[PDB]
Amino acid sequence: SMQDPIADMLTRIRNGQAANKAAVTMPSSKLKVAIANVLKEEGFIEDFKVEGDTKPELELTLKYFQGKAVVESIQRVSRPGLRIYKRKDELPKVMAGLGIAVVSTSKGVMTDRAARQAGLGGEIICYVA
Amino acid sequence: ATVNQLVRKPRARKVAKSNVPALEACPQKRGVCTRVYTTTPKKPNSALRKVCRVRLTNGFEVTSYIGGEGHNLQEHSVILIRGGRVKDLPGVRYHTVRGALDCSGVKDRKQARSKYGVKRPKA
Amino acid sequence: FGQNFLNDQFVIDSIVSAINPQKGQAMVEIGPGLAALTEPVGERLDQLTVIELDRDLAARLQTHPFLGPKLTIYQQDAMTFNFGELAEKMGQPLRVFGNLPYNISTPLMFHLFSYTDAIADMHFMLQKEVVNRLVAGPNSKAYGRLSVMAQYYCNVIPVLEVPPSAFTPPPKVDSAVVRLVPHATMPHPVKDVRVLSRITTEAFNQRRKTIRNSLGNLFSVEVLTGMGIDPAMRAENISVAQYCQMANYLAENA
RNA sequence: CACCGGCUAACUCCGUGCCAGCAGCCGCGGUAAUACGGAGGGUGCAAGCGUUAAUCGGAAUUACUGGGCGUAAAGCGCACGCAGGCGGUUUGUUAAGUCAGAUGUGAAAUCCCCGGGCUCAACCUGGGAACUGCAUCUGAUACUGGCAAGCUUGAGUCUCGUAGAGGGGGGUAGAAUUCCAGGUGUAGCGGUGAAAUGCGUAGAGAUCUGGAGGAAUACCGGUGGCGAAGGCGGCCCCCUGGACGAAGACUGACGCUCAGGUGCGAAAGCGUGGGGAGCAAACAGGAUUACCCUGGUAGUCCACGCCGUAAACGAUGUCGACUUGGAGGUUGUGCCCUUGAGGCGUGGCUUCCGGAGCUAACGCGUUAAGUCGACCGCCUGGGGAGUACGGCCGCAAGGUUAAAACUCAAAUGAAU
């Protein structure tokens, strides 16, 4: 059955980018919304919207520069079968700093650079290049 | 494959088998010659190679090769053997050290003398 | 059609050495053919009695270079005649051997076991499947009628294996050499051999079921209990001596 | 001191003639050998230089970092299911995991950094860093866990129908083969390349009439349908399992996978008792130079037990989500006008092409071998070997779990 919705959201984004879609939709949740906000601030997607009351659905708008998907590679790191946690001076860097890593700390969901700035560690969610 | 399967059963390394069991992790061994004879090689090769049957101090009994041209081995000769197999002679995995114990050096050698126990030509 | 003769010289040294034909014994080697098996008979026997069914071979066989006048040639089928006739002619049991088509090699030994004393020992080369059954014993899958009947007459000993690549147009099967030599005395004599064949044939015709009904067409449970034969064991478990026990009983009684 | 064919830095002459010999691998040597033995010249190390033994590397060749399973080694024959692993969404609380700070400890030596002393170096030595660990206090609350209360989209229940060789039991019908009893009738029939065994004057073979018994269901029939797989085919009744569709109501995470365990499982084979028309291992005969012909037993059939294996194959584990199209088949249903096989839709199962992508290639391609997540099974050069010894199971045949010594430098897949 469905046992990991974060990976499902990432796969929807990846498959939509590969097929030149304009937008993607999925069932919503708080964690998904937080991840979407972090993605938007770094300029990987255009915008996100949530609508619905009893069954909210989250709608994302994808982004292309010039006949090219801007999200080169998105990958899930800590899964239900194996969870990954890192201390502050072990947080990884993606493409030697050109990419981002989504980290869940005690103060919310941020990127690796923001966590390093705030001096925290946490759980690694995904790598986005 | 899966993490759970590996937790239940770890990866296992294959065990290496030595090629020279009669040496028993010793660089050389001493033995006594039981039979000195001549055998033929396997296909595409033609010769009459010289070998010997030797009984070691640890109880094993093996066949060893005698390199160079000419030798003086007979029955009840005490020799020293080392590792190394002969390719086109099935069942031979040890060489005989020339110039040690009852084995003598090769006559008239001038190149690569130290591999055949030949003293430097006092000439 | 085409037959496949023996060409390799390395193999046919063991056969000659194993027979070791001396002077003063009657050798009756059937089907010389190209004399591929009699040419390595160059230690010679000052005589031999040869049998060949074909006149063309017999005709272009009387001279050779050296053969000429040492052997008497018969041109009748070996399966038909009386070997024992040529037994008081010399006065001793005959020593024979052959390389016949496996196809016809079975009926001859059963035509030769009847004449008994006129025969001293044999050395034939047969198929490997068949050789194993001949020397086989109880409780295996190579145990059968052939084993029981042959073991009742003579002793079976394999002599030599021939790997398939020794013959020209080599087949898909392997050949072998066995040494059989008739017993001096019967360990278990039977009045009528045909009744023994009848019992073994019936028992091994239903080889896979218990003898309470495999062999119950003639016997009864309490009878077999009388002779100490378990009525719940398959035919392949019955020893030759036991098979001679009910062979004797079926004639002793009705 | 070792080396000078390639790997690998460094080349010529003489001798020998598949001999003598060399060799880590591939190999060299049968009359001009840069590969064997000597000499001249050269290359690499140097008070040392080579050989042998042993460990890691190269080896991503046990793969946590970091591999695979359609055809190369590798998906259990199929299902149910306990322990275990994993688990939709909202609010509150807790603070176990997790994160942050501090304190105690982590012997000295050694390894690393900056210095100092032996004429230099090896060596000796001062100070620091490190010792990635453990424990205890104080905090943080995003994520996982515990506890409490909810939600309806996952999973189930109810109402009405549809199609189907799905399963168990009992009846019955019509064609055909064999046998029996009657009619008409006279001399061959059967078989083969040709004959023979065989049947017949006690009337065969042929043709019509009546009966007995056993096994299987022509046409429909489909590339069609149903079943977890093995598999399921005349017609009628009784008992019974699943799938699918319409509208509405209800419960409220009740879920997925599954080592040991339990069940089902073609044909052949076995035990106890029946039955026996056709066919037919073995067997008994007749021929011709394998294969053929005439008889014919076990068996094939039924009731009840055992056996537990197949190229049991889509050579493709089960569950869920996402990703351009085109031709067919089969089976439901909503709406309009209505001669409707008339138009507009909406579901389930199934066959063939082919796009991106993937693949060693062949090829797969929304029923994936594409992009991902959860759990399970299995693989590690070829032969020896699915073998031996031991355990468990079986009436037996045998099934299942499962090595090593030794031996070779290959064995293999797709395409040209």
UniProtKB/Swiss-Prot annotation, chain C:
It is found in: Cytoplasm. Gene3D superfamilies: Ribosomal RNA adenine dimethylase-like, domain 2, Vaccinia Virus protein VP39. It comes from the Bacteria. Keywords: Cytoplasm, Methyltransferase, RNA-binding, rRNA processing, S-adenosyl-L-methionine, Transferase. Its EC number is 2.1.1.182. InterPro entries: KsgA/Erm, rRNA_Ade_diMease-like_C, rRNA_Ade_Mease_Trfase_CS, rRNA_Ade_methylase_Trfase_N, rRNA_adenine_dimethylase, SAM-dependent_MTases_sf. S-adenosyl-L-methionine binds at residues 4, 6, 31, 52, 77, 99. NCBIfam families: ksgA (TIGR00755). Specifically dimethylates two adjacent adenosines (A1518 and A1519) in the loop of a conserved hairpin near the 3'-end of 16S rRNA in the 30S particle. May play a critical role in biogenesis of 30S subunits. PANTHER family: DIMETHYLADENOSINE TRANSFERASE (PTHR11727), DIMETHYLADENOSINE TRANSFERASE-RELATED (PTHR11727:SF7). This is Ribosomal RNA small subunit methyltransferase A. The gene is rsmA.
